[PDB]
Amino acid sequence: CDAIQAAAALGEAGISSNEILELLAAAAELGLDPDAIQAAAQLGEAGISSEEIKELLRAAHELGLDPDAIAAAADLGQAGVSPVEILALLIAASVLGLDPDAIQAAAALGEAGISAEEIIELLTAARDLGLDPDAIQAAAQLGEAGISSEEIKELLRAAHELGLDPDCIAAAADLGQAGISSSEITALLLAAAAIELAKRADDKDVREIVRDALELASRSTNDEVIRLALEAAVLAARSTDSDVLEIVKDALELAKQSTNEEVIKLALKAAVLAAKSTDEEVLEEVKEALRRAKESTDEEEIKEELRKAVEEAE
Amino acid sequence: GLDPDCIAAAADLGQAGISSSEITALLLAAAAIELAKRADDKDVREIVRDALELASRSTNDEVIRLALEAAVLAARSTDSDVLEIVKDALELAKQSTNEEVIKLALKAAVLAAKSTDEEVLEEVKEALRRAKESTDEEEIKEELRKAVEEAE
Amino acid sequence: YKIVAAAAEFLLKILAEGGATPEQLERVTEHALEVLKEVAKELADSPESVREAVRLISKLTQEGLKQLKEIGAPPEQIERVAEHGLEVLKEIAKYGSKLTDSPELKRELYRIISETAKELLKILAEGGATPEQLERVTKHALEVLKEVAKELADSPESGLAALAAIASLAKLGLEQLKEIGAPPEQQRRVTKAGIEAVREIYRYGRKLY
């Protein structure tokens, strides 16, 4: 007896009789189905007033929401999302055109204490990157790992630039559970990518370069030097030109033998810029700046010749 | 006409500790709602809105049972005269602020919906018209009283 | 602009160190804001200039409220200058919307408006004002945000951002009202007004999507 079953559900939720009569009045006004009234009962278990529920369901009706999103409003209620923020997430889902699994991910991010603005931003970034619901589910696992919204955004950006699968992002969330910094996760992602690509490339010189970069990254302790070296390893593994491999090898031969971070930062920057460039004149001037750096001995002259080439290439 | 699973759900409102009159109200309400869903009629749906509004806003078991019994009777009837009388009674109950006027107006509408004499319908409609055109609660009560004492 | 803006802030801080009455401080603050608005309306002609204008207006506003808080003035004066600041800020945001076309700067500008609201609300709450003032200010702040959103918004993403900002302001405001222990009646009144602001924002959103 559906109308009485809905009343019994509100009775099991412990709703006051006048407030049952109000939720029934709302059900009669809007034509609420028993599962929409069950969502009202679950918002009542979340302690929301009949008035607030009524305006919320009135808004859901004025939005023309799909019943699955309307049911998922009770999941956002169980996640403890602020009453307005529930409406915001519902509006956002409607504007985004995403599935209820994106709403379940929003509920998980709500349990992780993430604001509706950050959720909306994360979903915005996800659609703008062209990421999928499994990548969004792994992002919710980074939320379970307590990673900050900006760190997730940059991690997702890096994962997209590396062409990673969602399972890779799940492994990144496992490094998050291990308490690894977003920087060190990013390094490990760069490294794993460079290594797998260095299997796919057969070339011993690429493999030497990638090993030398992985050695330098294992020996050093600075996040810029590490990211530059491992990015250079990914770039070397993506490259096909002996001029880029020579410039990178020369830069690594200078850098791995050097004791000052300044010339390492500059030489790795020059090599990364050369590997990203498309002009033989810039490659030759960088190869020249490295030749000048091998034939000279003063670190101030090495830094200046690398600075000239970097300011030409940047 | 509620079947035994409805009575089982009524026993579950018993498990929720709801008082017998409140269970009765909830049964009347749920019945009026399911009937007003099975009927398409916006006017019956307006009556059910206004009844459930009044029942939520007030707190007296006689007023509530009168209102929801009228809502069930509206969901069980089709004549425009009965719908007009019920809407006039609910409009008078929404505009006035005396529980004796509310009880008398709802009682007059319930008697008009239970009976089927067009002279009782017209005298109840005219007593409600006198009550809705006038301002004095004593004139409202004395017109509704004469109509009730003729109709009961 | 930065120089004269700094000169206004400096003069205000000097006057506050000088121990002038809350009334004199408020009068000078209004005059300073009015001048600041004028010289902003003249000198602003680029996205960064609007960003900087808002940053300086909000800065001077924050310093002003901090002075009134430190001297222990009644919340009434604080609420007046809060309204003045928001109103001026809105008029500048209005002008700045004519100068600014890039989505990033439009969004970040709105975000800074919301940060300004969040901060001035937080400052008033730290100021120990009654819920009776907190609701007036919260409502006005939401309404100013609504008017600014209605002025700026022209794509769904910016709508969602403005919505989310509004929602977060409601969340913060309700969190202050909860901390001061305001009655559920006031909590409902404010929350419903917040929902209604979001409903009006959705009535705008219906244009975009």
Residue numbers in the entry:
A (entry chain O): 1 to 314
B (entry chain T): 163 to 314
C (entry chain b): 522 to 730
Could you share sentences copied from the article?
Here we describe extendable linear, curved and angled protein building blocks, as well as inter-block interactions, that conform to specified geometric standards; assemblies designed using these blocks inherit their extendability and regular interaction surfaces, enabling them to be expanded or contracted by varying the number of modules, and reinforced with secondary struts. We construct twistless helix repeat (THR) protein blocks from identical straight α-helices (typically 2–4 helices in each unit); the length of the blocks can be varied simply by varying the number of repeat units. Restricting helical geometry to ideal straight helices with zero helical twist in principle considerably limits what types of structure could be built, but this is more than compensated by the great simplification of downstream material design, as illustrated below. Using X-ray crystallography and electron microscopy, we validate nanomaterial designs ranging from simple polygonal and circular oligomers that can be concentrically nested, up to large polyhedral nanocages and unbounded straight ‘train track’ assemblies with reconfigurable sizes and geometries that can be readily blueprinted.
Expandability over four different sizes was achieved with cage_O43_129 (+0, +4, +8 and +12 helices). The internal structure of the oligomers is clearly resolved in cryo-EM reconstructions for the first three sizes and in ns-EM reconstruction of the largest size; the distance between the centre of mass of the tetramer component to the centre of mass of the trimer component across the different sizes is 7.9, 9.4, 11.3 and 11.7 nm respectively. Views down each of the three symmetry axes (twofold, threefold and fourfold) are clear for each size (except for the threefold view in the largest size) with slight rotational deviations of the fourfold cyclic component compared to the design model, whereas the rotation of the threefold cyclic component holding the THR remains unperturbed as designed.
